[PDB]
Symmetry: C2
Subunit: 345 residues, 2 copies
């Protein structure tokens, strides 16, 4: 990751030289074996340069890592895919495609992997602007490097410009102020700049949806807001299956049972359940090797479900019942139907 | 109103003597004509004594004056009628009938006429304890006259003890305090005292549901809370029809059109629409009599729909969009389903 072609040449170079300095003696030269251990050493000792240069890439989440969220899935399809994959209908009905949408909800409930998924269906380059980048632009007073971000979105079109943690700045000046940050204002300017063409969609997501600039939520700007709740039972069984993918997990482990036990568990907590089960399998397997080598020389092939019990004993429902309460209060702050239901004639 | 049998005898006496002092001359004595004008004069000059003695009476609202509120109607039936009209099933399933329920919502949206209606189906004596009575008990430090109210409910069983404006005291000490009022505590004592038998149901209703004592909302006490929203289109067409009942209203007036125009209008505002239409019909009819008698001697049979236009010009949606917002926030403070939906097995 963060490896340009010259970095890859350096990687192959140092791996081949690790093979050379592993052989360590002319026919033996031709019999060199560049084995995966050499490439792993080269990776552990490779200094890449292409970090801090944000990568545009169609991500790999495929909407099955993020299960559930079916109405949110329909809104995201209608907001991203329909403008770009069926653009004739939009110009037929005269609807301008929406410039942006704004996720909100509990932290780490599958918001980043919910814009990657729709960027994957859209086959659009995904540009994630994390919260530290916005903060860095707010502190160096370099509020004009978000012109570069939007320009990079323009060249890398179609896009999903995931302004992750859009309320980082508002948290960073909690309190003389009141609205309209340094670089939030530049995001507003360069968001009002581009037309509804060029298929660049800003999906900036906020943990705290009330402290944000209310000028962001104006129409034309990120006017659609989409509540991303805590995972439903389908959503968190898909989350548990996705976090445990590529990891050798047992057959007698019942992942739907785990997803059925865990009600208020955010997606990040469901990762930390698996990352404390994998870690505990590491501990047991390493201890197995240790007491084998010291005694038997002189295996835990899979994460057994007894690891998903003593690992799940340290289960912290990280988001409170009063955080999601306030997110619901903001949610039907945005719900003001109020009697215009059954509008018939 | 407020007339005991001795007061009715005094009423007939003064009406008959008004007939006597209207005749004002023995055969003419037998030809006295006690006409309705004499009874109306007697009523206008009758001093009744039975006021300030609260009346227990099966009220006349019949659930059609309060239209709509269908789920609220089902909850009130299940809470009042089913304990008293089908009590075998409750002792079969071991369910104790709930001691009380607590309405809340926007002021004057049909909360008083929503406990009268269910007291009418239940055919239960309806005891309305208005907010000034609770305030009077809180100021005189006579917090032991609510023992008498509950005792009167016990004798007048089955009851609907509508503790109207239960949060009068909490408004009267808005702010050193914090909870547990003088006579709210006695309401709690005599509410916990009576058993689930005797069929006495407390339906105390609050405009402000958050300032009330949180010990009221404990189970056993007024644990069920029922949101009484602003009238729906069926509800406010029934309200407009009920307020205009006994008043001569035209045929070309379209009351469903009125109820369809008025979205945020509380029930009290829909009364003041009709009580400014009736008042303007009074003005036009009286002015008709005035310019007839001064000129033609020397009719507005009905409230025409041109009165319901210039009367509707002075239409004040009295409850704001921020009051009902807070009532909805309290309502989904009482909604924490949150993932236990689709609890299957």
């Amino acid at each position: 990751h963060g490896h340009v072609g010259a970095d890859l040449a350096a990687l192959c170079s140092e791996a081949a030289l690790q093979a050379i300095r592993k052989k360590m003696d002319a026919e033996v030269m031709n019999s060199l074996a560049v084995t995966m251990d050499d490439f792993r050493w080269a990776l552990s000792q490779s200094n890449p340069s292409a970090l801090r240069e944000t990568v545009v890439e169609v991500p790999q989440v495929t909407w099955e890592d993020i299960g559930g969220l079916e109405d949110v899935k329909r809104e995201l399809q209608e907001l991203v895919q329909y403008p770009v994959e069926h653009p004739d209908k939009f110009l037929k009905f005269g609807m301008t495609p929406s410039k942006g949408v704004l996720f909100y909800g509990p932290p780490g409930c599958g918001k980043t992997l919910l814009a990657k998924a729709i960027a994957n269906e859209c086959q659009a380059n995904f540009i994630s602007i994390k919260g530290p980048e916005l903060l860095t632009m707010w502190f160096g007073e370099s509020e004009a490097n978000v012109r570069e971000i939007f320009d990079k979105a323009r060249q890398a079109a179609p896009c999903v410009l995931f302004f992750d943690e859009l309320d980082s700045i508002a948290k960073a000046r909690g309190g003389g102020g009141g609205a309209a940050d340094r670089v939030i204002n530049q995001i507003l300017t360069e968001m009002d700049g581009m037309s509804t063409k060029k298929n660049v969609f800003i999906i900036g997501a906020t943990n705290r949806p009330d402290i944000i600039d209310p000028a962001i939520l104006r129409p034309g700007r990120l006017d659609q807001l989409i509540y991303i709740p805590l995972p439903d039972e389908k959503s968190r069984v898909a989350i548990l299956k996705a976090n445990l993918r590529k990891s050798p997990v047992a057959k007698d482990v019942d992942l739907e049972f785990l997803a059925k036990m865990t009600n208020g568990f955010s997606g990040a907590d469901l990762t930390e359940i698996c990352q404390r089960a994998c870690k505990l399998a590491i501990r047991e397997s390493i201890e197995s090797e240790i007491r084998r080598e010291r005694e038997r020389q002189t295996p835990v092939p899979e994460i057994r479900r007894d690891h998903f019990e003593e690992a799940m004993r340290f289960a912290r429902r990280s988001v409170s019942d009063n955080d999601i309460r306030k997110y619901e209060m903001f949610a039907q702050t945005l719900q003001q139907s109020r009697g215009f239901g059954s509008f018939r004639f």
